[PDB]
């Protein structure tokens, strides 16, 4: 696995001011604006859940309402459930979801399967 | 006019929280607050490390 030609271990060692040379434009604008209190709260919650877990076992899920959250490369391996307005969806953070928001992993609408039309 | 039936549908709201009652707490007083107004009368509550005020909320170490 590699992301812009960078291996994940270097990404784990990749400094915060120099990840602003590596993401897309929207992600870099967000991290230059900085994360608010709730996103760091989720970060600390995920770090606690990953740290306080058996090594052979997947970590315990963390439920959240945060969909504005951008996936940092620290989170790979954490097991996160995210609300879509009605139901939590349980998702594993993969290596290939560094450049993605959480909210696009829980779809907030159901696909349209058209029924027979009424009187129009 | 036409009257409604008034459905019952009992839902128990008795389990409501009340804060704990400490009985005869005047035993343990006998730090004094050197404040502008609440001096010489008010006792200055203890944590594990630091004592906090109960009237003016001053900050110490």
């Amino acid at each position: 696995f590699t992301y812009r030609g960078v291996d994940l271990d270097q990404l784990l060692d990749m400094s915060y001011e120099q990840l602003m040379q590596l993401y897309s434009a929207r992600q870099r604008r967000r991290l230059n604006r900085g994360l608010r209190r709730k996103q760091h709260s989720l970060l600390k919650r995920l770090r606690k859940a990953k740290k306080e877990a058996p090594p052979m076992e997947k970590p315990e899920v963390v439920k959240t309402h945060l969909r504005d959250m951008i996936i940092l490369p620290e989170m790979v391996g954490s097991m996160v459930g995210v609300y879509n307005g009605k139901t939590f969806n349980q998702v594993e953070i993969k290596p290939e979801m560094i450049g993605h928001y959480l909210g696009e992993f829980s779809i907030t609408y159901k696909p349209v399967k058209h029924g027979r039309p009424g009187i129009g | 006019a036409k009257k409604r039936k008034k459905k019952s549908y009992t839902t128990p709201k008795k389990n409501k929280h009340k804060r704990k009652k400490v009985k005869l707490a005047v035993l343990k007083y006998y730090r004094e607050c050197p404040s502008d107004e609440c001096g010489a009368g008010v006792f200055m509550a203890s944590h594990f490390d630091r004592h906090y005020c109960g009237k003016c909320c001053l900050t110490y170490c």
Partner: peptide, 30 residues
């Protein structure tokens, strides 16, 4: 009584307010 009727601490609260207002987004902690 009815008809006859008619600093350091503020600076500490100020700096606590400024600390909390800086703490809504810290942008630095890693």
């Amino acid at each position: 009584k009815f008809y006859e009727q008619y600093s350091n601490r503020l600076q500490e609260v100020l700096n606590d307010y400024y600390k909390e207002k800086a703490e809504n987004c810290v942008k630095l902690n890693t």
